[PDB]
Scaffold this active site. Structure first.
Site, PDB file in Angstrom:
ATOM      1  N   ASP A  99      -5.423   5.074  16.977  1.00 39.45           N
ATOM      2  CA  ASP A  99      -6.829   4.991  16.594  1.00 39.45           C
ATOM      3  C   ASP A  99      -7.263   3.535  16.519  1.00 39.45           C
ATOM      4  O   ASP A  99      -6.596   2.710  15.892  1.00 39.45           O
ATOM      5  CB  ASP A  99      -7.070   5.683  15.250  1.00 39.45           C
ATOM      6  N   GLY A 153       0.812  -1.202   0.000  1.00 43.90           N
ATOM      7  CA  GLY A 153       0.000   0.000   0.000  1.00 43.90           C
ATOM      8  C   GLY A 153       0.849   1.257   0.000  1.00 43.90           C
ATOM      9  O   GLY A 153       0.739   2.091  -0.898  1.00 43.90           O
TER      10      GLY A 153
END
Ligand SMILES: Nc1ncc(-c2sccc2C2CC2)nc1[C@H]1CC[C@@H](C(=O)O)CC1
Ligand SMILES: [Cl-]
Ligand SMILES: [Cl-]
Length: 243
Positions: A125, A12
């Site tokens: 997160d 990615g």
């Protein structure tokens, strides 16, 4: 140095790489700092040093940092997680119309809860895209849109906020959708404050539904603590990490 590794291919920018000395499979994250101010670079150094510190089986391990002042590129070298991210697993399930095993949900619950316990102790997160799977059934926490996992407190005014978010993540793992959905954040805030949602699918036990429901309580003080979560009879040795 960068020359110590061979890029296999881009995932990615993140890349799967092979260490030349022993052939170990890793990944690195590219970071072009050429356009950063001195101030922003100082913050980057303090953050990277932050990452070298935390060592835990359920937190993506960061091995090294490589500076290449030529292309002004910084490489953070880290553990390779062959199972990819949790967001893709959910997407795969949504499309193939196939729910995940309760055993898998229990593993994520157990190992993310241990990751959180560690984060709280050193004081990331908690969304599916930041949760990774390795090759041995272990779950690791890594480092404009609708805030599906925003807690009631966060909407105004807390470790119990992390519990809520875990609740949202586990809920989505089971149902293949978040507990509260909406088109605008205001509509979303509306649904959150009401605190109502569908039961997770019936293939999942009442005990599992119960604890996810508790994590989604409107009162932060009614949500179970990390300790109370791990005391749950659902959670067994095999649900934990194994090298
Ligand atoms: N360390 C990593 N290992 C694997 C992967 C991914 S993610 C989705 C595809 C796969 C693979 C198997 C083909 N991702 C990572 C990371 C990237 C970003 C990172 C961070 O923000 O620090 C977490 C780990
Ligand atoms: Cl349902
Ligand atoms: Cl492990």
């Amino acid at each position: 140095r960068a020359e110590d590794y061979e890029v296999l291919y881009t995932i990615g920018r993140c890349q799967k790489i092979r260490r030349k000395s022993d052939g170990k499979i890793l990944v690195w994250k590219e970071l072009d700092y050429g356009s950063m101010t001195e101030a922003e670079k100082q913050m980057l150094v303090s953050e990277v040093n932050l990452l070298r510190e935390l060592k835990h089986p359920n937190i993506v391990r960061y091995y090294d940092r490589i500076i290449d002042r030529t292309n002004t590129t910084l490489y953070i070298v880290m553990e390779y997680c062959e199972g990819g991210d949790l967001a893709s697993v959910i997407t795969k399930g949504t499309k193939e119309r196939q729910y995940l095993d309760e055993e898998f949900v229990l593993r994520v619950m157990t190992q993310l809860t241990l990751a959180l316990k560690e984060c709280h102790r050193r004081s990331r997160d908690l969304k599916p895209a930041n949760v990774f799977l390795d090759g041995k059934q272990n779950v690791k926490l890594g480092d404009v849109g609708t805030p599906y996992y925003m807690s009631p407190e966060q909407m105004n005014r807390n470790e119990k906020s992390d519990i809520w978010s875990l609740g949202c993540l586990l809920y989505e793992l089971c149902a293949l959708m978040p507990p509260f959905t909406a088109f605008s954040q205001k509509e979303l805030a509306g649904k959150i404050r009401e605190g109502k949602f569908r039961r997770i699918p019936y293939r999942y036990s009442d005990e599992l539904n119960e604890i996810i429901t508790r994590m989604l309580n409107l009162k932060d003080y009614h949500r179970p603590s990390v300790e109370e979560i791990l005391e749950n009879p659902l959670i067994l040795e095999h649900h934990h990490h194994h090298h």
